[PDB]
Symmetry: D2
Subunit: 120 residues, 4 copies
């Protein structure tokens, strides 16, 4: 249920393959339709989730370096997949930039993204 394409509510999209034993691998495109905005992502998921209706825990990282861009930063998304009609991956994220020590206190942004199988 995880393998495939997902869209957040703001114009990003990623493509992921969920390996049989817990690997996540794919590509994150921060601006739909812009190939210069595609970055590697890698992560993990629970490959034997509960069968009681609960979601499937997962996480992934994108370091914002590709051939076109280096933001000197990385985002991690932590969340759960919820299957069915209206499947979704509900996440909260942390975006850390490399900083000097004086600026470390402002290194890390927090937010949330809801991913769906259809565009907003």
């Amino acid at each position: 249920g995880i393998t495939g394409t997902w869209y957040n509510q703001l114009g990003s999209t990623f493509i992921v393959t969920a390996g049989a034993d817990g690997a996540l691998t794919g590509t994150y495109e921060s601006a739909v339709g812009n190939a210069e905005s595609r970055f590697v992502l890698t992560g993990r998921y629970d490959s034997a989730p509960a069968t009681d209706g609960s979601g499937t825990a997962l996480g992934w990282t994108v370091a914002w370096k590709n051939n076109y861009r280096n933001a000197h930063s990385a985002t991690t998304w932590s969340g759960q997949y919820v299957g069915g009609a209206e499947a979704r991956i509900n996440t909260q994220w942390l975006l850390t930039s490399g900083t000097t020590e004086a600026n470390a206190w402002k290194s890390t942004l927090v937010g949330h993204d809801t991913f769906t199988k259809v565009k907003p």
Copy 2:
């Protein structure tokens, strides 16, 4: 500078290899000296960081499933590596458990870890 073993301040340790083009791969052991507490981790880092003194952005995920344990949960660490004498990886983390929809609001813990090359 990232490749190798790191210890948080509370008794965990991980081992990571930083690939030339941004891959992080390794193992996270949640309780030092307990092999049943070793889990796969995967992530990304900025493989061309700034040279102005700033840290190197990175992130990784551990899904808490191995042959001995399934917590139906995953932690992502987001942070930066700071090299030199007293090298450290300073992070903030998100731990999401798979939940029912009614319990989703309590799915995700937040915290921080400081990793060093020597044990606390």
Copy 3:
């Protein structure tokens, strides 16, 4: 624009007064229509926000103790008010429980709430 009643998307509601010089005071009801679920809240807001279209920064705390309940915990909401038609207070929150030292690492939940002037 802040003074008044707000509803999150999940069944809570609060009532706030925004004082002229930055005070927030009011009541948070975690379950709409249940008076046993009303708790004091107090906080602050920027009483001279930018006039360029940007939101108004604010935050508040509820300690989850009233005459009916003590969860030994407190939530802080940090966010911004955005006025107009479809006014909203967009927030992220931290819920810390009192814990033993051994359990401190799991003391704090994170999430988000969007408040509107009309019920979901």
Copy 4:
């Protein structure tokens, strides 16, 4: 045990009064010894905590507006007080700036502070 002066590990300090029924009121000084860096804070704490060794949950907000400064932003600290020799208030914080809608995704920084009764 909460009433009094506390210092984070980076050069801030605040002064708080813990009211008998859960109020926190005081002043936060972001740069020790600089009176232009003093801002109102208000919050809540659990005024009947557990007696089993667990910490006392609390939170507070500072909106970063005073007579000298307006950063158009507010920080909330969520945490717990732990008494005894080496008393501490262990916190995680969210700092939200007022932003345009386009920039909302980058509105909120996250971090942590440990407060002690003695300066670092």
